[PDB]
């Protein structure tokens, strides 16, 4: 009967993909987004929640940014971040310019390394393709609440 192969990790041909370009220096602008649910019409959507232009700034419930401050974090953040970064997945120097291709490549790479089950690909791909809102529409959206995905899609 039709049986599936088993994955493997190897470093025999890694050196063949080492570029020689000088990356250069650039400043960074970090933006954080999360899945939220808005009470007007019940659909999940990606919403921004913070920014890191010069010092960390947060966004309130009314829709206005708070006060800048230094970036303070917690102990458990470092622990779980290190634990998940130890067995993380990297895709360096990927040649893509669209969100759909990036999502497909990440899902396929996760499938390769047994990060997720084959039947979890569709739901994650559907979840990553929701609309990415902005700060202006918040008053037009009537408020948001955090949400969690489900296999059934509800």
């Amino acid at each position: 009967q039709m049986e599936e192969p088993a994955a493997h990790d190897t470093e025999a041909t890694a050196t063949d993909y080492h570029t020689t370009s000088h990356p250069g220096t650039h400043k960074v602008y970090v933006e954080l987004q999360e899945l939220v649910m808005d009470e007007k019409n019940q659909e999940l959507r990606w919403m921004e929640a913070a920014r890191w232009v010069q010092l960390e700034e947060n966004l309130g419930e009314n829709g206005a940014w708070g006060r800048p401050h230094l970036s303070h974090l917690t102990f458990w953040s470092l622990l779980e971040l290190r634990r998940v970064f130890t067995k993380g997945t990297v895709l360096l120097d990927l040649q893509e310019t669209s969100l759909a291709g990036v999502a497909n490549q990440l899902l396929d790479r996760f499938i390769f390394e047994d990060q997720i089950r084959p039947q979890d690909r569709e739901e994650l791909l559907r979840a990553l393709l929701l609309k990415h809102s902005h700060a202006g529409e918040l008053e037009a959206l009537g408020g948001v609440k955090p949400a969690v995905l489900t296999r059934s899609g509800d």
Partner: peptide, 26 residues
């Protein structure tokens, strides 16, 4: 992406080897 590698089981001089893969064009 760059390349993906997989292992198989031992194949006898009589039998054949068959595999299938799934990906996504971009």
């Amino acid at each position: 992406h760059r390349e993906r590698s997989y292992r198989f089981r031992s194949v006898w001089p009589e039998n054949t080897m068959c595999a299938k893969f799934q990906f996504t064009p971009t």
